[PDB]
Subunit: 140 residues, 2 copies
């Protein structure tokens, strides 16, 4: 069924000025961009989003990285979009990602892994509601 | 000569899902995407942006088209970004636009140009102010 998931082009990717190349992967794969915006995450924003990692030993570096430069947050919509976005991105750790995935082709470390995607329907709904008001999501 | 300019990816380009391809032109040319968001322009927002053409006979069609689906408004930044952006878009009329420019490669007709770009330094400052707060522009 058609779905919506949250996708973020991270600071490393946006600083490489490869936003176009990444958006083209999503589009070529059949996903549509239905909302997007570029912003520099505040400390509070980054922490509120990644709240479930508050206690992990990487939290401080994650929030640091995710706030280190501007990103693009967006909503991708398409058939089976949530799982499709995961297969497109590849394994969270670029060393374990198969050739041709976004992470294998664009990332440096498990931290700077170029993009984020929601990992379930429950997390998608939560993550879209975090960055976007419904009336911002432009249907088509 | 580093400058900023307003770029818009229009409802026709968005509808074709070629956001990334258009974006890659700008990026591979040396320009950086320093602000962006997808919007569904309301009547009053389009009329506001095109206030100058309010007395014209096409005004109706222009606004009609620019509100017909989602767009991406953005600011490009880099060396003579204003002139550079206009080179990449090519002639306003796709039919006359040279091979290899955005409008020649993506646009159907004069009506559905695929893209908008500021024509001048004065209209850039006006156009950028209309859509973005300075706090949304992230120079890098």
């Amino acid at each position: 069924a058609t779905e919506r998931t949250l996708s973020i082009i991270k600071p490393d990717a946006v600083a490489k000025n490869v936003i176009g190349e990444i958006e083209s992967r999503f589009e070529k794969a059949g996903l549509k961009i239905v909302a997007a915006k570029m912003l520099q995450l505040s400390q509070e924003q980054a922490e509120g989003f990644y709240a479930e990692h508050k206690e992990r030993p990487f939290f401080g570096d994650l929030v640091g990285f995710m706030t280190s430069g501007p990103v693009v947050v967006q909503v991708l919509e398409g058939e089976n979009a949530i799982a499709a976005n995961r297969d497109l991105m590849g394994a969270t750790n670029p060393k374990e990602a198969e050739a041709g995935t976004i992470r294998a082709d664009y990332a440096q470390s498990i931290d700077a892994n170029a993009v984020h995607g929601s990992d379930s329907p429950e997390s998608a709904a939560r993550e879209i509601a975090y960055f976007f008001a419904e009336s911002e999501i432009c249907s088509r």
